[PDB]
Assembly symmetry: none
Homo-oligomer: 377 residues x 2
Amino acid sequence: AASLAARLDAVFDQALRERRLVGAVAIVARHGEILYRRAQGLADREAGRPMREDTLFRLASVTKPIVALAVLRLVARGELALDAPVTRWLPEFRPRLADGSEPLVTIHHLLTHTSGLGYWLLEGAGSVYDRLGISDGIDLRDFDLDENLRRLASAPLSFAPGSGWQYSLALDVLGAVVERATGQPLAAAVDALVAQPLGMRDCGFVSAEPERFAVPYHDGQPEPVRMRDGIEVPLPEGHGAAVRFAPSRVFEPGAYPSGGAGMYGSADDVLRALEAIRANPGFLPETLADAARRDQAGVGAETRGPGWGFGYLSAVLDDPAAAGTPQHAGTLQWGGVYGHSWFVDRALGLSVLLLTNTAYEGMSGPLTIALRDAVYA
Amino acid sequence: AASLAARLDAVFDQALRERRLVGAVAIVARHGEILYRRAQGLADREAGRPMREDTLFRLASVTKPIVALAVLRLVARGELALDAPVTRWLPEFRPRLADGSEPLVTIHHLLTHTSGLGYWLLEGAGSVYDRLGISDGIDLRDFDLDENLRRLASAPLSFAPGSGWQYSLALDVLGAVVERATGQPLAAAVDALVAQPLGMRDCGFVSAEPERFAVPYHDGQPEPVRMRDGIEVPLPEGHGAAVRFAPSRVFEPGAYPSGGAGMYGSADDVLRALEAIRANPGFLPETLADAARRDQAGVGAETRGPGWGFGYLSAVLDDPAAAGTPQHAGTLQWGGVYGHSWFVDRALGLSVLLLTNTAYEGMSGPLTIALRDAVYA
């Protein structure tokens, strides 16, 4: 605890001084024990509001494992089935292949990102998704979830369901599926199925408390830049084209619930979901819990580069060596474009969480590599 | 912030190490800027649940300034009046002097604790209050507020109203008064008059969320001991006889709302109340706010020993030298038998709060001195 904290703070002091990071919250738990839980830097640089351990964050893709858990909870009760056609819940979500034909898309294809769906960010401006007006869920658009899905459904699949892997809007699709199966709006379903059962009281999709949030910043010279609605931020090499951010999205009741990018939460709440995933204290049947954490795509998917497969909740480490990491085989990992990164090294009983207000340093920048290496020292 | 945090943390580490404290949440603000907001130790030692910044605490007498503010808000609106007799609202509340007569008891008399009323703790078992079965509001009893007050009023006053000072059930009496003036139960009234306007969202009288609380322990060697309903714990020298604790009281819907001892709240909520008192940004009319923070009793009252008077919300430091404290004249201070202590050193713009689960170390043990001295270090 003291030796680990020494290394992590050294990384944090350097990134803060180097104006590469505005503020963050990082927690390291081992077998349920908190070894590190510290707020760093600032939440709102202009107001001079220091970051706090329970400051709220726009989760972006950190929303995925939480929403994925809700899907699995419904599967466990038989309200959903891994092999069931998505059309049972979304009668009109019938995307076609490039040749015009209509394939079967199961709950399984969606949770694994093997359905053939994609994201606007994969190609950006001028692409098919850009022409059809498909949103990735991080911006604020004047239309609902059903509209976005209709636009999405009209884009051709990149490949046949199950024949490949591609990061996509599948979790946003599953969000609509959850609403149908549950009869409740997504926030209420997630609360009932995951949040409440796990004691996550500080999360949701729409907040009325801006004073509690970490104001989003993006990488910049000679210091990160405070985000505003509409800012398109180019993604790093091999990460896609760009992301259009809408920091006010979280306070707008009219922003449709994004199952792949629209929740907010505190670091303690996210940790709760990750610990549930890690230790499965009777939260899900064991076989389903094992399948969800196992690689369901193949190392060939290279989800975070070589050595990484993908399950029902995130990337799964199949090959530490090919991935160039000290993490053990079976490690679960993913992040969020707002500047977040997390991983559960199952063998070590470790849950490592990094939530930040600096996109993309806190997601893929050197910061993430230095913190990971410091935890392994 | 950094140096203060280091000093405060050293004090806390030593207390935890020596097993004089199970867990606590302390906040230090100066002129509205949070300098220290830190959770320490465990909320539930036996379950290994750590203390969190938002952990809920049974406030004991930290309830008084909050209820006092409610009373004061009604005064500001002309619903209550400082010199109005308590009988205008509680016709039957007619306590008598040892002489047999019914002296006037005003709102001012009650707020200041100069009405002549007392507490069972003043003398404990055998006493007059014991004979009449009067409750101090920390224990769980099978009768309502009106019955406790009917028992209270049947006791003779210790002195003529305004003739002296003595800690009492006056805020409990005021609690009833507030219910009459507003036509609402105490919890709703407080929420309407204080909690809602100050953004206090995690306070109240009855809670149904036990998992959010700090579990009550009492001082002990080797370590503090977890309390159960009905146990009696002797107060330290000069603080009265003892207190009968009922940790389940906060969860019982039939527990009468105690104006002097019955609320729960997070540390943030309490800071919101202390700050409103300290800075009064349009919460109460200036003259009333000044009166409330001004000594209305005299140094002679020695409310917290020599050098201390009392206003309408807490003790008011009149003589730092006599009180043997580094705190500046004009300082407001009070505590709670569950193990709490707070103070507002007005001259320095300081609001210092300590909420703990260890009775009475957190209220009056060395911990309180060591933290006070570290602040002014």
